[PDB]
Amino acid sequence: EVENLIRTFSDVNDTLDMWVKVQKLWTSLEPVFTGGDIARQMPLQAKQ
Amino acid sequence: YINMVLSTGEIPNLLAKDEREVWLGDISQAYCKEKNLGNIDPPQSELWTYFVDRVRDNFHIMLCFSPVGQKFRERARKFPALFNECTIDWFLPWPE
Amino acid sequence: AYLEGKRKKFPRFYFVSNPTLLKILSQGSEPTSIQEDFEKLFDAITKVTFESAKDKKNPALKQITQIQQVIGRNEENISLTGYYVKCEGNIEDWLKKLEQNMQQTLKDIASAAAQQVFQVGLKEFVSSQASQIALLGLQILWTSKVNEGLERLSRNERNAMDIKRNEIKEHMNILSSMCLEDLNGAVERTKVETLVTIQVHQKDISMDLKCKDVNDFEWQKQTRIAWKTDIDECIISITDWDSPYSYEFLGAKERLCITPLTDRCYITLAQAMSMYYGGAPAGPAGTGKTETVKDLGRTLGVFVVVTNCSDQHRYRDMAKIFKGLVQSGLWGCFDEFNRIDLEVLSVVAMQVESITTARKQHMKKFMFPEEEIEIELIPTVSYFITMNPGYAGRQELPENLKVLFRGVSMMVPDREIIIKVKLASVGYLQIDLLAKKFNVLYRLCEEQLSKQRHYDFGLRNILSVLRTAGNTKRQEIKSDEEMLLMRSLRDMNLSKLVADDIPLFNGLLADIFPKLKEVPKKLYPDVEKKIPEEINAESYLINTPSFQLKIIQLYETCLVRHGFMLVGPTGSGKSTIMKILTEVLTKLGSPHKIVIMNPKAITAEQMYGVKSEISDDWIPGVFSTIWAKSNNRALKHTTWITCDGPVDAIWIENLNTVLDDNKILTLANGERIAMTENCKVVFEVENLNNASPATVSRCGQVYVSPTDLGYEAVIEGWIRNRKASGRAEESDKLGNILRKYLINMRFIELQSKECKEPMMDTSPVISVINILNLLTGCLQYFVQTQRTLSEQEYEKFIVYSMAWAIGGIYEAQDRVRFHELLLAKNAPIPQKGKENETVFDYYVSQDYLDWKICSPEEWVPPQSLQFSQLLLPTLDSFRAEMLLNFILTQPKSHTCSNSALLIGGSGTAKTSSVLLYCNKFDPQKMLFKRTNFSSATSPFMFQSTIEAECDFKVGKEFAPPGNKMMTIFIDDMSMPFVNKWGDQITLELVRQLIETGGFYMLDKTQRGNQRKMKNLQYIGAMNHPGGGRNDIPNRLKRQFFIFNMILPLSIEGIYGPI
Amino acid sequence: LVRKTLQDTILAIDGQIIMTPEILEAINAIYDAKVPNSWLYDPSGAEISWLLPNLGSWSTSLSDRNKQLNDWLRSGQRPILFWLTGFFNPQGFLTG
Amino acid sequence: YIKGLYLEGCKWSKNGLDDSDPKKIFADLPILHVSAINKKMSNTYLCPVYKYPKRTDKYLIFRVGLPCEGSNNPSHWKLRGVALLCST
Amino acid sequence: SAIYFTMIEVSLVNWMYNSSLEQFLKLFIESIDLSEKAQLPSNRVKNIISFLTFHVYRYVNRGLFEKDKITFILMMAFKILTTAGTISSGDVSLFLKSGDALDIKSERQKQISYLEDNQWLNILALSKHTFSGQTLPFFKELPDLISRSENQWRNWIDKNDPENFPIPDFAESINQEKEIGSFISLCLVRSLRNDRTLIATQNFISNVLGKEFTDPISYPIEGIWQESSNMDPVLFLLSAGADPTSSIDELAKKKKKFPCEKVSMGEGQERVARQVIMKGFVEGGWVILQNCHLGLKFMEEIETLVSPINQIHEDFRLWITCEQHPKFPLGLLQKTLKVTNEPPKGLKAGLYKTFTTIITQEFIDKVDHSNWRSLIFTICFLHSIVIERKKFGPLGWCVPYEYNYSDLEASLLYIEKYLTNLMSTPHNLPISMNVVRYMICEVQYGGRITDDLDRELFITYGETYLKDGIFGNDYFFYDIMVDQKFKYRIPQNPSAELIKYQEYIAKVPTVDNPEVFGLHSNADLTFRLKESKEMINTVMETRPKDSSVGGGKTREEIVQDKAKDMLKNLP
């Protein structure tokens, strides 16, 4: 049970460590490309 | 607190105001007898002053400090009538 | 990578943070949105006008048609007369277009002014032109006048330079007589002041030039701006280094006074730039290294990007700035660059070394370290490091950096030159003479006078004098310049000075100004007639010249300042000067109220109000609610919010915004209460010791020394008060006797010499106040019976009242010396006694009047006895009972507060002798409450007990149960914690409560309203100071009558009956 | 300041008082004939007494300096030949 | 009439400043008579009187004009490091 | 054991000096093996002791700056004598103090004209000191002997070399004691004629440790590489204005490593250094780390990286170069081979360093006029003379400003700009307006200068060196009687050759007369005194705080007796 819980919490950490990061990245870039003027340019980086 | 207790004889706002009258009720029968057999019902301000003096007479505070500790010297300066008001018996190093 | 791609198109972006760039590029479409961030991109272009343009074809496209620099409410506006900036879609292309058209307009405007300045007056020119081009125009004029002067010396036309110097003086008289016109706005003031900071330096130089040719080095040294018609471009020469003007719109910026050091610093900084080495001026803090580098930039019309360097700066953060400077072609001083971590500077060195090597070879492009591509270098780059040797920050720079930067050691700027400029800036001629005098005085008086805390003879007080010395020059121009300054020096400092230092000052003032025989003061004939008239209302007030003088001096400061404070020792007559002045001003039009509070008595959080930790609701502040009540324009009330307690760094900091010229009180909840004309702030501080030198210079301090209201005046008043009590014959006789021992012979001065080690250190006035109290208390019997006595019967009572008031504080050894001194001066004493017999044993009896040995009342065994709770009548208890009776039976007065502290050794029967006195009180007629103080006891602990013990109320006033006249014994009064500032917080509440008879309620609901207890007496008992035990505040000592309890010589009388 | 420190240094070695940080420094200095930094500079950093390296020479000056002040103060008349060294503020004397 | 100032680098030989005697550092100066002139040059050495031998700008008291008339320039004394020490 | 506890005394002087016990044991073990093998057991022991002392002194002396080189060998000499009964702690204590505790008021009157007031209190201290293994004070009745009308004592103090000549009245009894006699003959010279203490100590060290200790070692870089292994790096302690990186590459050419990796340590240079050192580790090659004191975090990591646990090639040698830094990682100092590269700080050695380095043949051909080469020498000659003034202390410069070569480069770069503008214009001398030249060379150097009276001094040097008559051949700055007399000219070159300037700098004397700086002959007695007071002050800090001094009086009891003797003299 403990070894399975350790394995669980190891995979939880790997997920949650990645989550907070992806959020912060997303939180940084959410205003730029949703915003019109930068997104008017960089058609390739807008589609992504 | 034990300084305050030793000098005053009483802590301010220690016990509830309703709990005074219960305590002072039991105290009264000794008080009337002790004061040259007065045998009149005391007021609750004149009953306290006896109870406080009754506390001090009965309540002893043995302190047990170390003279080498740096706090000991500070506590004497910081708390008056914790050193002055209680008899200091000094423990010398053991003889042969 | 796209951001770095835009950054490279408009370099100045390098100096903005990534969020702000992303905001600007995202809002590139709507150019009104960018308007907030203009002040980060460029220098002194705070706001931009946006016209409608192309309103016929391709509409809703705005066009920029003027550059604004906004200082406070006023602006400097340079309109783009042609070269309009039509603002296209792409922000970084129209922003480049704006920086291009900025310069191209200034070049056009400056070109047409450097032509106009020759064929137009200097008063006429400077008004028409924008700050930056008036400065540039004035500089162009002067360097033409010198050149042309020296050119004519080389051809041998004699007195050709003397003719040009005379013009240069006219040019300077114009600029000083434009400081006298007080033109509106902060822009035109900063425009005319910067012109004057230049033209004193222009005059100073060309007054002692002495060059027989233009090419002679003493002229080449000088900073010279000239408009070359051949290359049609302004060129600024320093030594051999001829830079063109950069044409950055600087607007109206404050210029530092140009010292002979600063001129020699400018040459070094120029020689560095010519050789392509960096510059790095290194001096102590306050020399303005940053400001002198900026001043050179503003002289060349180039933007200087300041970057406040710190530990948090990395090698990447620094590399971004340097990639901005090189690509832009702007200078870039680094304020406090030493404070950068040494790790960083090793990497920055390779960045600066890579920039240097590119500038030396004249490379159009070079590869920066950690950059893949070669970046464009503008030739007119520079980079400066304002360091600090004797560093407060980190160790000296690396070995690589030292090579790259040419230092300038910058001394502290000569004070005389600062003053000289500032006197010119005001509107004085012969600045050189005055500025020498004015310096000499303040430099000398600082050394000669006593080093007291309220004395400031640094630049803070100097600049304060010159604005008040200026306001006086504008109004009376015809008046002599020396006498106006001499007068404005005098009237401000005289108030501050202690009694000992007034003859020293007036001497220095008569040393440095021997031409000026006498200067007339501001008469103030309305108020001067009221003070005598007002004083003779109250029976107890005596009017001395030295007291009337200090009332006037408080009124002089009350008119100009809004934060005037009243310094002086205890019993100096500060509170009474306040009360008199207000009672005078009441009778001359508008009424004047005083609201006494103690800021120390209450916690900082509880005075100003703070956010409650429970229920998240705002509790009103005590001061805020007094301030808000006090600041209303209704029925010309003009209240004075006085702060009796001592000033400390903690509580004045919150109130610091009120004292300053802003005059708005911030509670730090987003509420800012404006100060009305009518309301004023006062401080009845004793010392002013533990207060910052800044907060002192804001307020206008009047000092009241001990000798202004002498104890002789207090005694003379007390006797005046007896005659108004209906008992003139008594007072007449008590006069003859009081004068004989107190003023005729200085007995308190003679006693204090002969008797050593007084157990409590009291002032001579305190001792006299206590005499007059105890002398009352003795004769209070004979008032009731209307019994006048002889001069023998009073002369016994007075020497008793003297003995205990003056010599009570003395221990047994000194009591004998004190009694031996009464035998020398032939006072009435007990003729006969035993060995070690003193005056202190005896007293003067009411029944029959003579000296009687004070034997204690015979003991009556209290039925059943316990040695532990058995207190007997003793000689020491009797004397204590007797003295306590005299102070506590008295009616409250000006001298007495009905309160009697008794000092004495550990276990000397202080606490006992009070408890012996506090029995035999009729429970109906008097009450008694004992509150033992300790190091823990805070003012809220003490305030909560007294508030609970007297709840009965007569209207507004509070009282003890029924109307008993409770006597509040405070055992171990000294114990409460003395803080770093040396001020006992809980005792400043005790003092407030004895003096004013109240404090301010601290229940959330009701704040800024006083609770006033009607009938309270106060006993205290404390172990006498010294040996790491707390002394009571000097201020509080004056309220209490003080006597020393001594261990008995024989305890036979005490323990013999037991 | 000297009087205070010297007395405490005689007490501190005998064990009458605890060794303060200033008194330990003063005892170290006096052994190696250097002036205790307490006497040369105050906590703030301002100069309080003349800067001589050796203790012996510092102590002769204290006697010589004090003598010129005392012989001026006690006697009415001022010295014919002033010892400019002997003043704490010689710049202040000359302005005098 | 100030007394007990010591010339470092130089001696006083009553014909103005003179070269120091071998192995005799800090030669004592005679009684200096200081006054005020009331304001209102070559071959007169404007020597600095220092509080200590350390000589920093803090321990500068004042400057004293020392004649140096015969066969030695004032600039030759500045290089020799001539200065009047109170302390040593 | 003595020597190692000297190395712990040296740790207190400077943080960079501290060496491990584990580094000492290598020297101690090596000193047994390398020593001469004797058949007699006492001769074998004698042979190890001689070899040990030197072999460790050699090792320690290498990682010591020139100011603290003579201080260490004096500590080592006391630490050897303090173990035997020859010197006590009170004896060592005297030499350092020597009656600077005594005050003239309490003690005897001087009585003698020729002694200074300090020289007399120094006498008095000897008169009251019993030394070690003697009944009564050795020097009791010295103040009687010197007070006697004997010119022998006046002559001995007045001598140039007092420490080399025998003591006029006490010589005969000093020769009888061999072990202590050398130390009491030093204490006399510290007392009377203090200035000759550094020279008097050499005489003493040579009679305690042997001649080999007074002689200069001057370690070449080939020796520093031969001493070093792959696992133990070579730390260089850099005094300001020194760079050994060139001297490594010079040795690297002979060892076929010349194109070696170099890495200026800083922020984000850790990732570069790792990549560089991992190549060096396997491939082989030298790795010079510069300004290492700045990048402290890597210096903790490099200790564990260059450990034997990681595979290192035998060829690979690591070279660290860093200026002294407090809170340097101790661990590395205890592994590294510590060397100090300090400038030789003479006038010749100064001039040599500028003409070998920053002046090149390219440089002296930049303007292409006689009057540029003439001026190049005068600015470079002035440069050295302004540096070597700092030796003489507060007489030299009120405040000592380290005048870098940047000040020389700038002042020269200026003269190019100035002369090129006069070269452009049509005895073939340019105008060279020296009024300007003065000011600008007293603006490039004036950058450092904070003091107003130090400024006025430099300004004055300008007026003596950069006068109009330097361009003429028959001008010679200062023609001093140094050795008959050296001329101190501007060397004349028909054709501009760097060799002919370097050739003349050979002929310049090593021992700089004080007359070259415009000072008096007595300036060296003020210099010598300062560097000897500095030696005594550095060895005073190292002294142990042990109460057991010897002679039946503790450290605290000596302080007590003084503190009581002061209190009665207070007013």
Ligand SMILES: Nc1ncnc2c1ncn2[C@@H]1O[C@H](COP(=O)(O)OP(=O)(O)OP(=O)(O)O)[C@@H](O)[C@H]1O
């Ligand atoms: N002009 C006067 N004539 C006579 N008595 C005076 C006069 N002015 C003040 N006094 C009296 O002298 C005492 C001075 O107290 P006052 O409060 O005026 O001074 P203070 O300096 O504010 O005292 P503190 O600050 O210590 O409370 C009081 O007894 C007061 O009534």
Ligand SMILES: Nc1ncnc2c1ncn2[C@@H]1O[C@H](COP(=O)(O)OP(=O)(O)O)[C@@H](O)[C@H]1O
């Ligand atoms: N009149 C008296 N009768 C009996 N005991 C007394 C009397 N006066 C003082 N003492 C005793 O002397 C001591 C004095 O201490 P205390 O009364 O607490 O005063 P203090 O404030 O000086 O400590 C107590 O132990 C008290 O019992």
Ligand SMILES: [Mg+2]
């Ligand atoms: Mg008052």
Ligand SMILES: [Mg+2]
């Ligand atoms: Mg008590």
